[PDB]
Design an enzyme around this catalytic site. Structure first.
Site, PDB file in Angstrom:
ATOM      1  CD  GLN A  86      -3.005   0.918   2.282  1.00 38.92           C
ATOM      2  OE1 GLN A  86      -3.085  -0.125   2.925  1.00 38.92           O
ATOM      3  NE2 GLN A  86      -3.856   1.915   2.437  1.00 38.92           N
ATOM      4  CB  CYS A  91      -6.279  -1.242   3.601  1.00 38.88           C
ATOM      5  SG  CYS A  91      -7.706  -0.513   4.474  1.00 38.88           S
ATOM      6  CG  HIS A 128      -5.183  -1.362   7.956  1.00 36.08           C
ATOM      7  ND1 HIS A 128      -5.274  -0.355   7.000  1.00 36.08           N
ATOM      8  CD2 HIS A 128      -4.045  -2.035   7.709  1.00 36.08           C
ATOM      9  CE1 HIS A 128      -4.241  -0.447   6.192  1.00 36.08           C
ATOM     10  NE2 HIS A 128      -3.491  -1.464   6.595  1.00 36.08           N
ATOM     11  CG  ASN A 180      -0.391  -4.126   7.673  1.00 38.15           C
ATOM     12  OD1 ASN A 180      -0.926  -3.529   6.752  1.00 38.15           O
ATOM     13  ND2 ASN A 180      -0.005  -3.511   8.783  1.00 38.15           N
ATOM     14  CD1 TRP A 232      -0.647  -0.125   5.067  1.00 34.40           C
ATOM     15  CD2 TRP A 232       0.263  -0.041   7.102  1.00 34.40           C
ATOM     16  NE1 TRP A 232      -1.392   0.754   5.813  1.00 34.40           N
ATOM     17  CE2 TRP A 232      -0.861   0.816   7.073  1.00 34.40           C
ATOM     18  CE3 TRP A 232       1.009  -0.139   8.287  1.00 34.40           C
ATOM     19  CZ2 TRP A 232      -1.256   1.576   8.184  1.00 34.40           C
ATOM     20  CZ3 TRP A 232       0.621   0.625   9.386  1.00 34.40           C
ATOM     21  CH2 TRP A 232      -0.509   1.467   9.326  1.00 34.40           C
TER      22      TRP A 232
HETATM   23  C1  LIG Z   1      -8.068   1.090   4.708  1.00 32.28           C
HETATM   24  C2  LIG Z   1      -6.663   1.702   4.681  1.00 32.28           C
HETATM   25  O1  LIG Z   1      -6.047   1.810   3.605  1.00 32.28           O
HETATM   26  O2  LIG Z   1      -6.151   2.118   5.738  1.00 32.28           O
HETATM   27  C3  LIG Z   1      -9.075   2.248   4.482  1.00 32.28           C
HETATM   28  O3  LIG Z   1      -8.869   3.227   5.528  1.00 32.28           O
HETATM   29  C4  LIG Z   1     -10.533   1.806   4.425  1.00 32.28           C
HETATM   30  O4  LIG Z   1     -11.171   1.944   3.381  1.00 32.28           O
HETATM   31  N1  LIG Z   1     -11.084   1.275   5.538  1.00 32.28           N
HETATM   32  C5  LIG Z   1     -12.440   0.720   5.576  1.00 32.28           C
HETATM   33  C6  LIG Z   1     -12.551  -0.293   6.708  1.00 32.28           C
HETATM   34  C7  LIG Z   1     -11.973  -1.646   6.267  1.00 32.28           C
HETATM   35  C8  LIG Z   1     -12.952  -2.474   5.411  1.00 32.28           C
HETATM   36  C9  LIG Z   1     -11.464  -2.435   7.472  1.00 32.28           C
HETATM   37  C10 LIG Z   1     -13.515   1.759   5.722  1.00 32.28           C
HETATM   38  O5  LIG Z   1     -13.292   2.698   6.461  1.00 32.28           O
HETATM   39  N2  LIG Z   1     -14.659   1.569   5.035  1.00 32.28           N
HETATM   40  C11 LIG Z   1     -15.823   2.453   5.063  1.00 32.28           C
HETATM   41  C12 LIG Z   1     -16.589   2.401   3.735  1.00 32.28           C
HETATM   42  C13 LIG Z   1     -18.112   2.560   3.849  1.00 32.28           C
HETATM   43  C14 LIG Z   1     -18.831   2.096   2.569  1.00 32.28           C
HETATM   44  N3  LIG Z   1     -18.426   2.867   1.387  1.00 32.28           N
HETATM   45  C15 LIG Z   1     -18.508   2.468   0.093  1.00 32.28           C
HETATM   46  N4  LIG Z   1     -18.066   3.286  -0.877  1.00 32.28           N
HETATM   47  N5  LIG Z   1     -19.012   1.283  -0.291  1.00 32.28           N
END
Ligand SMILES: *[C@@H](C(=O)O)[C@H](O)C(=O)N[C@@H](CC(C)C)C(=O)NCCCCNC(N)=[NH2+]
Ligand SMILES: [Ca+2]
Ligand SMILES: [Ca+2]
Ligand SMILES: [Cl-]
Length: 313
Positions: A71, A77, A230, A254, A256
């Site tokens: 990443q 992620c 994450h 991870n 990363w």
């Molecule tokens: C992950 C990263 O690169 O650090 C990134 O912050 C991320 O997208 N995290 C997710 C949670 C993961 C599945 C554990 C997140 O925050 N998702 C929220 C999305 C809500 C729904 N949105 C859409 N567009 N479908």
């Protein structure tokens, strides 16, 4: 360069080779429109093609492995964990990644990938211009500096969503279905059945993709080595002899490519000494900061909250 509104990769590829020009994608051009729609990224990026980045670029070096998914400065992620999972089932990976693609033969600055969308495979064509800063990829890269399939896959998936910024939020299962056409199911680990290890074990052995996360309510780092909010890839499950009793382990990665759990069964845990030499070989135990580590099944269910399995139809 071309008028591409409804033309296939083959047509465009051949046309570029005839004209002796590198493809520039009209639908997803190498400028700020393809990066963001609302918020700008703080650093301004230069778009370069992999031949401009290093002397001897390659699409795939030593296969498409999870170690190739590292990443960068973009919170995708959710998607990266899914590709990493997919590389555990090479059979399925090659439906997404056309492997007849190269920088050293018929290079015309054009590549393609396939995703499962609305009940069919969809082809997505891209130029190979990628965002860079100080001549390095800012978003996803491989741990091999000359390997570019994972950077280009990310670009193609970003194109499918309209921009790189459109990959900021998401669910691992959305991506798993886009790569497999499987059916996702998610599990709250606090209501985990008694036999979930067995469920997880059957799923990986069948080539089902498995991600997980720790609920949130560059993402929050914990002293124990884990990252909240994450997406992690589940890359193995095994039992091992340890002081008479058999201990159940879970292996995570991870996305990363670094920052690992530091507790029991982590890379540098001293009590690996107490484990048999053949077992360490079986579990592919390595002291290397690659983002992959084993933890105990008990520590796993204590820390993690979501488990996502994409089952093949
Ligand atoms: C992950 C990263 O690169 O650090 C990134 O912050 C991320 O997208 N995290 C997710 C949670 C993961 C599945 C554990 C997140 O925050 N998702 C929220 C999305 C809500 C729904 N949105 C859409 N567009 N479908
Ligand atoms: Ca590789
Ligand atoms: Ca490791
Ligand atoms: Cl190549």
């Amino acid at each position: 360069i071309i008028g591409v509104k409804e033309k296939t990769f083959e047509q465009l590829h051949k046309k570029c080779l005839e004209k002796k020009v590198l493809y520039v994608d009209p639908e997803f051009p190498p400028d700020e429109t393809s990066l963001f729609y609302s918020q700008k990224f703080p650093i301004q990026f230069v778009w370069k093609r992999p031949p401009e980045i290093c002397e001897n670029p390659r699409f795939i070096i030593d296969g498409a492995n999870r170690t190739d998914i590292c990443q960068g400065e973009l919170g995708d992620c959710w998607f990266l964990a899914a590709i990493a999972c997919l590389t555990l089932n090479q059979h399925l990976l090659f439906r997404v990644i056309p492997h007849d693609q190269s920088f050293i033969e018929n290079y015309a600055g054009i590549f393609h990938f396939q995703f499962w969308r609305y009940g069919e495979w969809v082809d997505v064509v891209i130029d190979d211009c990628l965002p860079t800063y100080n001549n390095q990829l800012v978003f996803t890269k491989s741990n091999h500096r000359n390997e570019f399939w994972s950077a280009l896959l990310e670009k193609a998936y970003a194109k499918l969503h309209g921009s790189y910024e459109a990959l900021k939020g998401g669910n691992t299962t959305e991506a798993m279905e886009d790569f497999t056409g499987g059916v996702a199911e998610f599990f709250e680990i606090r209501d985990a059945p008694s036999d979930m290890y067995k469920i997880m074990k059957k799923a990986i052995e069948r080539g089902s993709l498995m991600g997980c996360s720790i609920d949130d309510g560059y993402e929050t780092r914990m002293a124990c080595g884990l990252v909240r909010g994450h997406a992690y890839s589940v890359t193995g499950l095994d039992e091992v002899p340890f002081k008479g009793e058999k201990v159940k382990l879970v292996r995570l990665r991870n996305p990363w490519g670094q920052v690992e759990w530091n507790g029991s069964w982590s890379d540098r845990w001293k009590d690996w000494s107490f484990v048999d030499k053949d077992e360490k070989a079986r579990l592919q135990h390595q002291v290397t900061e690659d983002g992959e580590f084993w933890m105990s099944y008990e520590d796993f269910i204590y820390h993690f909250t979501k488990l996502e399995i994409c089952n093949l139809t």
